[PDB]
Symmetry: C4
């Protein structure tokens, strides 16, 4: 806006120069009978407006004096007054204001399209923003907290809009209809308010982070396209790690046709072994769709070594998972898990361990305001003897799940020093503490920030097939001998059936190809894993038989 | 003010020009025997004070040199020093004390007349201002809270004054005597203070919004012209909608309004159940079940199944929406009457499953509006 | 500092002008054989430094060119660079800093003498400062609260120093030794800390406002020259006003020789009557040393009318006060005083009423943290029925003493409307509410702010005879017939005895002259009231008999 | 940095001058057949770019006019626009971001070496810095509290960094690897976090101040080189002074230090009485009389009459002074040992009536000082 005003002024200046130069020649002629060239006219007019004033060309008439004077004042006005004033008002004042006084962004420009609206800032969403700023996605966080909007604009890896997240006028200004996605990370009541409100304007996909798993149905009702029970998921993860030996954890039941389950490898026979050596696919009929270790979901190779901290992601039928549990097989007796911290996550961990069930003890300094189902040992786990008196000694595992990382580090530090034998699973509230938790002696660390972001991020990047894969089922099919040699693009499975190929695995290998390219040549006896509607899964073996 | 001093300066300049032009001609004549025209004196003086310096017209005498030096230094003092120092001191300084450091208005212009003072800004009064904008009144809201004065400075269809509502010196700079009307929407003790204070200065009509209907008489006594028991009115509105045996009405929220609702259902009578997360500080005529309506089995363990009606009356609209959603989810047909604290939430309450929605802001503003128009 | 730097620059500029002018003439001569005058030299040098450049006087030599150039650059540097920069750095930058950013005054300049140090800001001291700013006394308030020091510098009717009030380094910077007086209005422990600390530096008189009357001796021990029990005094004042009829309140016992007592006139026979009509001096032998009414301690005239709100200040012997109490004389039965608010002042009021004693009831919403001696009826006096249930009906008086003026107004409003008969005494925390308390129906209002300031102010203005009148006694003497006609300055009572004349009263009048001028002619039979040491009160009748 | 750009500009100017002076001579010659000296070219160019404009040397040709116009516009662009815009943009802007809006230091210069990091500023560490100033170390204190960073910016004999003490990215910009020593004076859990974090970057020696002596072992385990149990030391100091039957010692204040004092008197043994206004959150081996030592009969109703010694150990120095005064007032000769939290109060405690005064700041600093010098 300002460079235009700047150089539009330069246009006016230039036109003024020509005009005065032209009139200068006109007057020198008609008033004094002197002829000057165009260059002389420019030269004189510059000399005067610029106040150099050589004096080698002057008028002698009064009318020439009046004109010289007019041109002279014009220079003083348009080079010594307007120009610096224009500068101090179009450049300096705006900058000094924005740099001395926070001016809240109330509204998003009309043209904004395909942006990600973030409602409710916290470690999870802060980590999300940093993780997808590495992709340079357009993130707008929205807050109704003035002191917060300030703080977020100074280290702005993101634009901030200050406004009530539940006003439709605000949402309109945020251009929610034009938005790509929306993360709803407010309280459950505010989220409910937000979804209903956004839904009154648009059909933009909303991802809600629910604080109490029972409110999930309620938030879908309000209009959330996806609901993520973080504290439950986080508790579940502190849970599967706390047992002395690893154990299956069912993730998705895709109609009873295909199950997805995860298995931590600690304490299991598979620990220390390589994948093909453990022979899981051969003995279970399961598919290993990935090895999550060190924060990276990698694809399974035969020579890939499973460590105590590894976690297998598995897919197969209900009976194939039962075979795996037999191979493990039987849990050790007198398992006793101390869960320090009885907030939402601590509660979630205990609730997961009760699903099995595994004997646990909850400790917290205060009584839960939300839970009435769990008996808790009240005490400060930091003040001496409190853990001892709770029977920390006959414990086989400690989950340390406090809202404070330093306390978690300190507890992990102490427990591992007094009980070098037992399993220690620690909660990291920020990723800046994960390493020290390990250094303190924790066997595994669950990092809320990254886990939360990994989920939300994947729901975001796989959005184009998220609400597609929502209501749809993932299934597995033995590659029919008819296509033993043909390529994916040649078979044309999608325009006939409507399903997609998300995995191919070899008949006698633990090696699987994830999301195969259309030029992939299909081998004989191979096993396909597909995803599609519950009307395309039945119209598969039908349509594939017809053509 | 800035224009006058600036153009008063231009006048002094213009005088100084004519002065120097004339002295120039006078000296040129008497000192050097040269005759120059009036236009030549202007042109020369402009030429020298502007530092152009053509040099085509110069004195040759010492006295002419001395004069020329004086006019040169004048141009510098008055165009290159004072004029720019003028700019900065005169109107770059107002820009700092009004744009870099927030300066709240502590007084209205002496001649302010016909304005409606607002004491106690809230959804109701904010809705009132944004409702009567087509009549174009000058609404002035008054707060003694700096941060609130600051936030109300940008969100505007109204002016903000900052000072103690109960200070007579503050009300005078507010020009109460010349105001059209006062809306007193502070606490009952504060309103009483305000009325008595205003009544010591003037007879400006006051509309007081009262929290406890028993205090209505006291507020009229302090000097309020009208008294509006909004919470009683709002509660009566909810109770009316909850009905028009085995009839049982669940009233979630036992604040002042939910209380008014139950006070209403007492007269019918229709049996009800009050739930609140707190013991009431002002009431002890009603039996309340304590608990957070949001947490869990709280509503079930209060017996919300054999209820025939539900009134949602929390001071928080998102809570209201959430409860409405949850109740409509559990029981597809049970009559739900819901409270909207701000009119921004009215539609989501309906979308949540409510059968009728009482809109506090809209109801308050209408009463207050119809009181501002009909009384004045 | 800056105007000196400003015009010292103008000196350098001027010297530069002369120098260049002189050299200009020197060079025109020796380099070109041209002679110019001094005026021509000034004229040329100004023309060039100022960049006018007429061109009617130029050099032709190269050395003349070099010189013209040097002078030219000098003007650009010293009129176009230095001068505006010097301005933007000595004028603009300091102002913009002080006006955009609060710079705390850490220290008082060395030369500061005779200033009043204020430690502990509140309504009392805020009122004090405004009351003695009308005298233009030098007030420095000291605070260790940053956010407060800011707030006080914007509406500065006073300089603010930001610092720990108990650091001797701070006190040294405050120049406590050079100070006139010091008001110690911190907590009792901080005050104790302050006195001891100040006393380690100087002997500057300290006035301490004690929060708990029992700590008074403790604070004198620490070094306070004067101790003021505000809450006790304030309670006492709500107390003497709450009874249905006025009653003597003893103030000072000057060794048993002379007592000072105050008497509110409400309910007494003296109400409605004029002073000489009530004939108090004649019937009691007392002196009426003043009539406090409407915030003004006036002198008593015979025709002065006593109203229900008046308060007599009285002086005389123990027996003369007993005579007055008989004249009153006997209090009405079934007195019942409701005291709403049981903080320090409320407690003080009850404690005063117990000195008599008068039956009272204390009401408060919380239990006192400091008092264990008073039985209190717990309740919110605002929520309905609470007062009724307390038996507010058989009350003869209500003291309303809450920390909140609006609540006091509202209570006063309600009580007077439900009980138009009973005595209502209200507490005003700020003077901006005193009038409305009266308008609400209060019979008398005690204004903490003004009362506090009136006391502190008088201890300050009478400082030159405060620590003098501290340890000294005030006494009254019948004017001996020997001086029946002589003038004060002629008697020479001070250089003989050492006492002072602070009052003269006529033999058959209620008219008294306060602080008589030395030219006063003494009448026959008159009664003198004097003040002096307990060694000059005995060496009075001795020295006055000898000469 | 500002000097270089500024004087690099002067160089460009000087080049431009010589350039224009030479072109001037060249054009004057080839275009007009006039020969001018080098000095004449400087003088002319200075005359034109500076807008003086003597006019004694002017071209007569169009090409000479065009050139003169170019040099004139150059003077304006480079002396009346860029140079002043240079001033403001180059060093009037740093003045706003460093003097009108506080900018905390979030990182130390890359080459910072030999500095002592302070984590947890308090009277002890503040006394430590102001004590070792004669050795002239570069003390850097680190806070994660903005307002505290701000206040510590003015009160200085030390530098202030602002960031999370337990962030590895923050400790790296703090150049821990090249630091002389670290004083860890946060809470026990925070100290543990800090040690482990520092130990992942470097082997810089750490002196941790520990609150609960049982946690000493844990802190060494986390990586602290020395562990200092100050509160135990301070309490032992008080208990030593309270003594060197019917001996009974009143210990006012049952925080960590007063506890340490009583833990000390247990070993002798000398019977004592603890008074505190609160139940201890960390202790339950000692019996405590609850009450505020200041309020009233509290000390008498605890039996402070038959006490033979009194230890004042409150976290507040004015409270300590006040109690000492009151105790010395009641009993003229009873041994009183008093705690000074900051050394500013040591003398008033003595003036209050104390027999011995333990100065936390002075004792802490000496230990920490003698640990900084002797270990390094
Ligand atoms: N030292 C401690 N000992 C026992 N419990 C603690 C301690 N410190 C914190 N806690 C508890 O840990 C819980 C924190 O969990 P919270 O953040 O509130 O929910 P969530 O479990 O989902 O993270 C709190 O309830 C808190 O009381
Ligand atoms: N989740 C909740 N469950 C039960 N009561 C609630 C809940 N949230 C708010 N409330 C109650 O709503 C009341 C607010 O009262 P108020 O705004 O004065 O009028 P109303 O009668 O409409 O509730 C409070 O007493 C508060 O305790
Ligand atoms: N509505 C009320 N009903 C009863 N007591 C009240 C009410 N409001 C305030 N109070 C009490 O009045 C007392 C205020 O006195 P406070 O300022 O604390 O000491 P002081 O008596 O010296 O002024 C408080 O203890 C407070 O509890
Ligand atoms: N007026 C008081 N009466 C009794 N105890 C007090 C009083 N003021 C402070 N305290 C106590 O002093 C204690 C402070 O403990 P701390 O600073 O950790 O070390 P210390 O052992 O020296 O007291 C607190 O427990 C606090 O309750
Ligand atoms: O510059 C003025 C000019 O005006 C006309 O065009 C004349 O023809 C020309 O001779 C003259 O030079
Ligand atoms: O201005 C220069 C002057 O120098 C000497 O003083 C000469 O005597 C004088 O003739 C000349 O005018
Ligand atoms: Ca860390
Ligand atoms: Ca809404
Ligand atoms: Ca008032
Ligand atoms: Ca001190
Ligand atoms: K010329
Ligand atoms: K010229
Ligand atoms: K010029
Ligand atoms: K010029
Ligand atoms: K010129
Ligand atoms: Zn639970
Ligand atoms: Zn009720
Ligand atoms: Zn009491
Ligand atoms: Zn202990």
């Amino acid at each position: 806006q300002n460079l235009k005003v700047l150089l539009l002024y330069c246009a006016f200046l230039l036109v003024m120069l020509l005009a005065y130069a032209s009139i200068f020649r006109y007057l020198m002629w008609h008033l004094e009978g002197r002829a000057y060239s165009f260059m002389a006219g420019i030269y004189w007019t510059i000399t005067v407006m610029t106040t150099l004033g050589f004096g080698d060309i002057t008028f002698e008439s009064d009318a020439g004096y009046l004109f010289a004077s007019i041109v002279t004042v014009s220079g003083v006005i348009f080079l010594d007054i307007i120009l610096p004033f224009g500068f101090v008002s179009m450049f300096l004042a705006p900058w000094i204001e924005r740099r001395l006084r926070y001016h809240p962004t109330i509204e998003l420009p009309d043209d904004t399209r395909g942006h990600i609206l973030i409602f409710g800032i916290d470690p999870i969403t802060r980590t999300l923003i940093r993780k997808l700023e590495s992709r340079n996605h357009l993130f707008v966080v929205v807050t109704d907290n003035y002191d917060q909007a300030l703080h977020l604009e100074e280290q702005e890896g993101f634009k901030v809009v200050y406004g009530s997240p539940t006003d439709a006028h605000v949402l309109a200004g945020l251009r929610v209809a034009a938005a790509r996605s929306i993360i709803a990370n407010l309280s459950d009541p505010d989220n409910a308010n937000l979804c209903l409100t956004v839904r009154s304007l648009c059909q933009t996909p909303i991802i809600a982070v629910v604080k109490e798993p029972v409110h999930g149905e309620l938030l879908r009702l309000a209009g959330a396209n996806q609901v993520v029970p973080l504290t439950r998921i986080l508790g579940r993860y502190l849970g599967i790690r706390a047992t002395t030996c690893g154990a299956l954890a069912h993730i998705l039941d895709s109609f009873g046709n295909l199950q997805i389950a995860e298995l931590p490898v600690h304490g299991t026979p598979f620990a220390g072994k390589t994948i093909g050596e453990s022979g899981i696919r051969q003995r279970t009929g399961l598919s290993i769709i990935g090895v999550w270790e060190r924060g990276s979901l990698t694809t399974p190779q035969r020579e890939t070594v499973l460590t105590e901290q590894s976690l297998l992601v598995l897919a197969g039928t209900k009976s194939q998972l039962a075979a795996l549990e037999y191979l493990i097989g039987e849990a050790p007796e007198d398992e006793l898990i101390f869960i320090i911290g009885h907030g939402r996550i601590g509660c979630a961990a205990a609730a997961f361990l009760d699903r099995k069930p595994v004997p646990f003890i909850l400790i917290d300094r205060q009584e839960s305001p939300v839970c009435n189902d769990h008996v808790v040992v009240y005490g400060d786990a930091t003040v001496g003897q409190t853990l001892r008196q709770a029977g920390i000694d006959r414990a086989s595992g400690i989950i340390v799940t406090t809202n404070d990382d330093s306390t978690n580090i300190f507890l992990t530090l102490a427990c591992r020093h007094l009980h070098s034998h037992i399993r220690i699973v620690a909660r990291a509230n920020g990723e800046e503490n994960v390493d020290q938790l390990y250094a303190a002696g924790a066997d595994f660390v669950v990092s809320n920030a990254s886990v939360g972001a990994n989920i939300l991020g994947n729901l975001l990047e796989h959005k184009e097939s998220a609400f597609l894969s929502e209501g749809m089922a993932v299934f597995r099919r033995p590659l029919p001998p008819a296509m033993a040699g043909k390529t994916i693009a040649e078979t044309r499975l999608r325009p006939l059936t409507g399903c997609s190929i998300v995995a191919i695995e070899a008949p006698d290998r633990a090696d699987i190809l994830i999301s195969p390219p259309p030029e992939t040549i299909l081998a004989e006896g191979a096993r396909l894993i597909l995803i599609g509607t519950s009307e395309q899964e039945k119209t598969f073996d039908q349509t594939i038989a017809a053509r």
